[PDB]
Write a protein that binds this DNA or RNA. Structure first.
Ligand SMILES: [Mg+2]
Lengths: 138, 185, 136, 224, 386
RNA sequence: GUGAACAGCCUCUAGUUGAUAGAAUAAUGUAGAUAAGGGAAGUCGGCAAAAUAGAUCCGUAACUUCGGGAUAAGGAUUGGC
RNA sequence: AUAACGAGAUUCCCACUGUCCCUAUCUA
RNA sequence: GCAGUCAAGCGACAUUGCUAUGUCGGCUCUUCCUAUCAUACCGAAGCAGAAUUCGGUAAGCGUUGGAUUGUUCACCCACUAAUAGGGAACGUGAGCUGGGUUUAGACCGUCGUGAGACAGGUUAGUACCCUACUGAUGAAUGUUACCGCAAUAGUAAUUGAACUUAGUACGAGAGGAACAGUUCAUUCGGAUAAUUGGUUUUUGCGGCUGUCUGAUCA
RNA sequence: UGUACAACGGGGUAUUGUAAGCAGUAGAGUAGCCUGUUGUUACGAUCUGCUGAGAUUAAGCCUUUGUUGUCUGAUUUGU
């Protein structure tokens, strides 16, 4: 078994889902669902589509580089399948997932910080410019 | 392979029975293998298709009595024709006993006309076919087909020359005698 | 299955019916193949014989070196270009449908094969895999 | 020299790979093919029932020597794990992300020298050189692009397809630093690389191999 | 006239007439051989279809080219909550076939089966078993007489069981009564075992098990009045044929002067009871065990139920049986599971099905995540979070 | 108004709400469409459908009664600011 | 007594397409 | 067949030389016959194996896609185990096709003084009634409801490949099998949306053109 | 007259694709005042941040610790 990352969205592609394309260049492209496959068939650029992870990574909407992401790699060199190592990896994956979620939440908070001041300023502008409405209200 | 069938072979025997003499009207291009405006006993005309049977009948009457066309499929049946109420003229449909260079098979229905371009090239010298179009000193006859297609503007979508159509037209013109050729005695 | 097959054939979607044109994938000089019939297919009323990846078909070369034209020889399809069910659980399809020409014994006319070669064809035909520089 | 057969395929090289320290065979069919190697190899070197990308052509999808083994991208993680477990640490296993997955056909190599398809990028060439620890050169046998299918090599000698020219034979012999002979296998089959598998002390070919072919194989490989 | 061509007849003639089934419950026709050398056990079970899902199984089929490979395939999920015995039937052989001797009911019955005996239940006084319950007690004799009569003359014993509909997400609220023949020990042992189970519940793992082969019997999907083209697969006429083109043109010859019954006329399609055999059970689930959809090759503590629930069906929440292939009938439909009915010994039956991974992605669309945790990890925090 | 146009569509002045209708969307029909791979292998027969369609620029063959073929054929562009 | 032109008769090539392989869906 | 040959009976078997004047055809459909092409089971053949010939019962199944005839005449390519022969008004016009035949116009050849005809070739042509069948309601059975038996009618599976047997028996060589066990596929039949393909009136979500609501939004 | 039913609302799962509005030292370029040589103030398709935002969600998707409403309308049946 192997979950594949969508070429157009990087989303996990579980077995028996989506469509795969093989070109004369002797490489394979996997699409999670028909939407991504149709978008690719139109020669669209994922970096210019807002609903694909490529744009978010390029646009900086989410943490693009982090230390946690270094754990996940294509292990071209296998391991001898030690029983203790299996349990250690099982615990480490959960710990890394929790840490990555915390870091992503922190990054989102840092990106969204300051919206409160803008909202307060907009409310002040709306209140100041509508005296008659307030007078009629009370 | 075409130009023969039971319904076609039957007519030959019918005209032979209905005719008392047969005269050679075979093509003059290959003696070893007649126009309207220029040139009771039943005489039957025997020969391959596109040999001159219909044209020879028409020129005798000085009018287009019989249908004449380059296509071998002139007619599957014969009819009686008379001149001066002296001799009866009967022309059998062309029968080829058990090809494309001869007026036998229509070039339209052939799926692979390109391979016959070397055949026509063999019959005629370089200059004789060059004088027909005079486009280049061609070599690699496929290149000759492409050159003729470009000269005549016979190109498919994208810009590729129409090799099949150009070859078909070349063979059709060869059937008309546009490119002179003859068999040495 | 015809001679040269070393195992059972998987059930895959029919891509090339009779008369379908498939590009060549060998250095034999041919460029396109015209399918006239499919070997091992059970003919039924109104049902045009159709091939698929790894199938052996009889075809006549339409374009390429004239020496190979007008003659019918067995051909093996290397690319289908129609989605088929792979047991690994992926609906994969190839960019262009293509085939190769080989004798009934399975020996490849061309010394080598160009472009990707389907897994279901290389696995079933040892000669195709040996003469194919790319699989999948 | 020993005669054997796959289920019914005489191309032993397609369904098996043999080296000086390990052997690989297809899992499909029965154990008759597996037992044939045991009669000659016994338990001296490992014999692994392994598949590559779900195919039985593992002999042509993978290439390697006693120092390392290479597999294409299509190989699943399960196959890589099984190969790692079933082979000693002295035999390296390295996944290859090259465009041409036909490692067995693209790469023809022995314990000292290797030949690769020129289209292979220099990165994969360096990876092959480092993992296998052998000299790697871009060469073809008289225009035969697939060196791994039209050539067989070993520390004792090598064999190429008959169409190889005398000049090509001399050049390849000089490059590989081993004797080479142009001949056929499996009763005139020109695909020598895929027809049979050979090592420094054991050559296995299909039943169709004629007596002159077996004698030539034994003489060139110095098996007796 | 030999018509110059031979073609197979369109549609199997054995599945006629193609009429609607008389009940949504597909009654079982034949039970297994009923060899009395084995312990008493049930022969069938009742379940409700709960959609389907995909499975990846490490095929170990020897000889096959998929041996030791990984193959993805479809599996159907049927909601099979525990079943409760509510009576027994004693059958006595007669020259005119099997005949029902007498029926004995339990001491008390749940409202689910009492509801099955009324069509205006909300208006009903609910007098289901007012006197029968009174007859059961105060002597312990009237029922015992029926039990003795059954023991004396019965030949095959059938247990009256009904599904716990209230446990299922269905809003039906009505149970389905069914007769299940008792196999195993002698008829006296059969009735003794059934008697001890009065008012009790029977699980599903005691009847079926992993790797077991079962036969699916249920009513197929209804489609109403259908044209012959789809009803029997008749080929369409070329185009714009007079008086229609989607119908069989020639119906019969002058002699005979009547329309042959086999000329495949148009009519009702679907809703016909069908029987399928050789269905291998892939997994037996329990509602009290967490991680029902987990596997030794997955480790994920997730239920088989897809994200957001099934389509047109609720959450399993009970015991379920996983079976490969497709089962007749649509979702939330009552389907009866029956044994193979014969001593199957094919290697497929002997095969052991150890699932590698179970698909629990949402069936509501192009699902990309197996559990909400994966979706949260991928998409991350959203605006609504803060 | 758009558009070369009284081509096609919307709007102002002016004039109409007249064609028995309520519920459902069974088969089969009438009118109009979409479809993975092949692209006529169907049929007596390319029957029907489809495909190019306006404008700007390059280019345009055989024949010819030199007036035509010709918008031959085949190619590049079309929005907004 | 043969150019152009044609709701004239027939053959063939490119594009094309549910005529077909094999039918399926929608709208009034 | 012609002209002989001998001869059990009242002339059998054997025996001598040579030797198209019509329109029916095709797409779908159901059923029936064996005079068996293929499949099951057997006997005889120089059957050593392999392959093949004939013969016996057996009709369940299967008996095709194409170059090509309007065609009655009827010939070829390829797959497949094989591509067997027939009937039901040589079934099937209120089923279709009018393809061909056959009105009213017109063109070419023969004759006919003429109108016209053909030995002839071409062109264009106007069920809503009853029953049967497929589906579907229904009064009377003391009422309703549930669970059951089955008189009866129909009936289905079909065929080839792949591993082991085994390069083993057989065989001088060439080559080359049984059985049993195991794995797929061809045709057909019953289901079903798990995955993928297809449909968009979810007019669900976005963009595009003309026009209109003063502009934005809508 | 209660794990009772129905209309909404809250979540889960999906479809599409970043809504109105605000601000920008992004924005090819063209103009008033001025006096540069990042002048400033105006027009400016687009782009940037709020904003994986906005909208729909069953008419045949799952759930509902909430709000509101409903629960005696006619006929027939006898050994
Ligand atoms: Mg003529």
């Amino acid at each position: 078994m192997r979950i594949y990352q969508c070429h157009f969205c990087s989303s996990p592609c579980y077995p028996g889902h989506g469509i795969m394309f093989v070109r004369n260049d002797a490489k394979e492209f996997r699409f999670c669902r028909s939407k991504c496959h149709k978008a690719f068939k139109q020669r669209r650029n994922p970096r210019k589509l807002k609903w694909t992870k490529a744009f978010r990574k390029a646009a900086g909407k989410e943490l693009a580089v982090d230390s946690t992401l270094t754990f996940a790699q294509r292990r071209n060199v296998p391991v001898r399948y030690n029983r203790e190592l299996v349990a250690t990896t099982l615990k480490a994956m959960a710990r890394i997932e929790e840490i990555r979620q915390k870091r992503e939440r922190a990054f989102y908070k840092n990106r969204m910080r300051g919206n409160k001041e803008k909202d307060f300023l907009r409310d002040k502008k709306l209140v100041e410019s509508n005296p008659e409405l307030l007078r009629i209200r009370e | 392979s075409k130009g023969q069938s039971k319904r076609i072979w039957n007519e030959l025997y019918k005209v032979i029975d209905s005719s008392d003499v047969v005269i050679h009207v075979l093509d003059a291009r290959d003696p070893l293998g007649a126009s309207i405006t220029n040139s009771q006993i039943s005489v039957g005309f025997i020969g391959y298709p596109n040999t001159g049977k219909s044209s020879i009948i028409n020129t005798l009457r000085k009018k287009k009595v019989c249908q004449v066309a380059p296509i071998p499929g002139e007619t599957k049946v014969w009819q009686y024709i008379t001149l001066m109420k002296r001799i009866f003229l009967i022309d059998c449909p062309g029968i080829v006993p058990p090809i494309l260079f001869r007026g036998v098979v229509r070039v339209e229905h052939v799926t692979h006309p390109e391979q016959y371009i070397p055949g026509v090239l063999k019959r005629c010298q370089v200059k004789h076919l060059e004088r027909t179009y005079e486009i280049s000193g061609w070599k690699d006859a496929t290149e000759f087909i492409e050159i003729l297609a470009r000269k005549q503007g016979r190109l498919l979508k994208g810009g590729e020359p129409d090799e099949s159509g150009v070859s078909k037209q070349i063979l059709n013109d060869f059937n008309r005698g546009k490119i002179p050729w003859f068999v040495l005695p | 299955s015809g001679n040269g097959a070393q195992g059972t054939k998987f059930r895959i979607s029919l891509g090339l019916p009779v008369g379908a044109i498939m590009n060549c994938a060998d250095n034999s000089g041919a460029r396109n193949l015209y399918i006239i019939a499919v070997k091992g297919s059970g003919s039924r009323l109104n049902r045009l014989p159709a091939a698929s990846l790894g199938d052996m078909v009889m075809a006549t070369v339409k374009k390429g070196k004239p020496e190979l034209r007008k003659k019918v020889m067995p051909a093996i399809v290397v690319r289908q270009a129609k989605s088929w069910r792979r047991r690994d659980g992926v609906f994969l399809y190839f960019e262009d449908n293509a085939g190769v020409i080989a004798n009934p014994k399975g020996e490849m006319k061309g010394s080598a094969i160009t472009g990707p070669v389907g897994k279901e064809c290389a696995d079933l035909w040892p000669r195709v895999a040996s003469n194919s520089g790319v699989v999948v | 020299a020993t005669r054997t057969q796959f289920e019914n395929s005489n191309e032993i090289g397609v369904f098996s790979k043999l080296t000086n320290t390990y052997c690989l065979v297809a899992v499909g069919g029965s154990e008759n093919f597996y037992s044939a190697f045991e009669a000659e190899l016994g338990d001296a070197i490992p014999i692994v029932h392994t598949t590559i990308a779900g195919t039985r052509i593992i002999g042509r999808m993978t290439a390697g020597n006693r120092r390392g083994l290479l597999v294409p991208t299509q190989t699943t993680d399960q196959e890589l794990q099984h190969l790692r477990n079933s082979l000693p640490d002295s035999v390296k296993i390295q996944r290859v992300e090259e465009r041409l997955s036909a490692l067995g056909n693209v790469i023809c190599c022995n314990d000292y020298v290797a030949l690769v398809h020129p289209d292979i990028d220099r990165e994969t060439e360096e990876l092959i050189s480092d993992v296998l620890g052998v000299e790697v050169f871009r060469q073809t046998i008289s225009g035969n692009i697939l060196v791994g299918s039209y050539c067989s090599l070993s520390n004792q000698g090598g064999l190429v397809h008959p169409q190889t020219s005398v000049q090509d034979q001399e050049e390849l012999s000089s490059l590989l630093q081993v004797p080479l002979v142009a001949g056929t296998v499996n009763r005139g089959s020109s695909v020598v690389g895929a027809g049979m598998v050979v090592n420094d002390y054991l050559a296995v070919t299909g039943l169709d191999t004629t007596a002159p072919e077996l004698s030539v194989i034994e003489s060139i490989f110095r098996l007796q | 006239s030999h018509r110059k061509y031979e073609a197979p007849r369109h549609g199997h003639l054995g599945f006629l007439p193609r009429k609607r089934a008389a009940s949504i419950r597909a009654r079982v026709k034949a039970f297994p051989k009923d060899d009395r050398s084995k312990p008493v056990a049930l022969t069938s079970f009742l379940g409700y279809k709960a959609g389907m899902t995909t499975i990846v199984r490490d095929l170990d089929r020897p000889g096959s080219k998929f041996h030791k490979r990984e193959v993805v395939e479809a599996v159907t999920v049927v909601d099979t909550p525990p079943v409760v015995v509510v009576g027994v039937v004693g059958y006595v052989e007669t020259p005119r076939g099997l005949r029902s001797l007498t029926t004995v009911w339990a001491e008390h019955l749940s409202d689910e089966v009492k509801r099955r005996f009324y069509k205006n239940w909300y208006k009903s006084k609910k007098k289901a078993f007012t006197k029968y319950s009174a007859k059961y007690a105060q002597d312990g004799a009237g029922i015992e007489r029926e039990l003795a009569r059954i023991k004396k003359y019965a030949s095959v014993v059938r247990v009256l069981v009904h599904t716990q509909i209230r446990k299922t997400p269905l809003a039906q609220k009505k149970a389905h009564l069914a007769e299940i023949q008792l196999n195993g020990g002698s008829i006296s042992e059969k009735v003794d075992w059934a008697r001890e189970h009065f008012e009790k519940t029977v699980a599903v793992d005691s009847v079926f098990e992993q790797n077991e082969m079962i036969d699916a019997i249920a009513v197929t999907k209804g489609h109403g009045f259908e044209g012959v083209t789809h009803r029997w697969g008749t080929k369409k006429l070329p185009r714009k044929t007079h008086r229609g083109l989607r119908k069989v043109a020639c119906i019969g010859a002058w002699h005979p002067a009547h329309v042959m019954w086999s000329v495949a006329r148009a009519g009702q399609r679907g809703y016909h009871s069908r029987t399928s055999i050789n269905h291998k059970i892939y997994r037996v689930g329990k509602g009290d065990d967490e991680a029902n959809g987990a596997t030794s090759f997955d480790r994920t503590k997730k239920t088989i139920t897809p994200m957001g629930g099934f389509v047109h069906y609720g959450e399993i929440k009970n015991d379920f049986i996983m079976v490969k292939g497709c089962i007749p009938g649509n979702r939330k439909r009552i389907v009866t599971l029956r044994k193979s009915l014969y001593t199957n010994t094919s290697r497929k039956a002997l095969e052991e099905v150890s699932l590698k991974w179970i698909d629990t992605a949402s069936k509501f669309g192009k699902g990309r995540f197996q559990t909400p945790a994966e979706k949260h990890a991928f998409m991350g925090t959203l605006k609504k979070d803060l």
